[PDB]
């Protein structure tokens, strides 16, 4: 089948980026290498924004989870890998890893099902 809507993550904390996006295959997954911003964050912000439009912060906000494990880093060095698996039922498994201490956390977020 195809996703119920354009799925993507929020980068730069506040912007909407697309990863899965509607009109794709439900059984999808991918691990990309993104960088962090603001030296000395010691924590990355991975927001799951599922939508396709200009100026987000209004579309379907999947979920928000806070990561940690990137001590004082002048950008570029931080290594965050994001994997997103979409299931038939309508779930998304997001995970961001940090390269500085070996910290990583994962969370499950229901795409759009409900009743």
């Amino acid at each position: 089948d195809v996703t119920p809507l354009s799925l993507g993550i929020e980068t730069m904390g506040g912007v909407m980026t697309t990863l899965i996006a509607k009109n794709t295959t439900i059984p999808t997954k991918h691990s990309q290498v993104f960088s962090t911003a603001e030296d000395n964050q010691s924590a990355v912000t991975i927001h799951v924004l599922q939508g396709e439009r200009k100026r987000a912060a209004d579309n379907k906000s999947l979920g928000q989870f806070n990561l940690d494990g990137i001590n004082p880093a002048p950008r570029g060095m931080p290594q965050i890998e994001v994997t997103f698996d979409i299931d038939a039922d309508g779930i998304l498994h997001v995970s961001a890893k940090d390269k500085n201490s070996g910290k990583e956390q994962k969370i499950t977020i229901k795409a759009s099902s409900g009743l």
Partner: peptide
């Protein structure tokens, strides 16, 4: 093209 800022 896309980084990752916190708040």
């Amino acid at each position: 093209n896309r980084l990752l800022l916190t708040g």
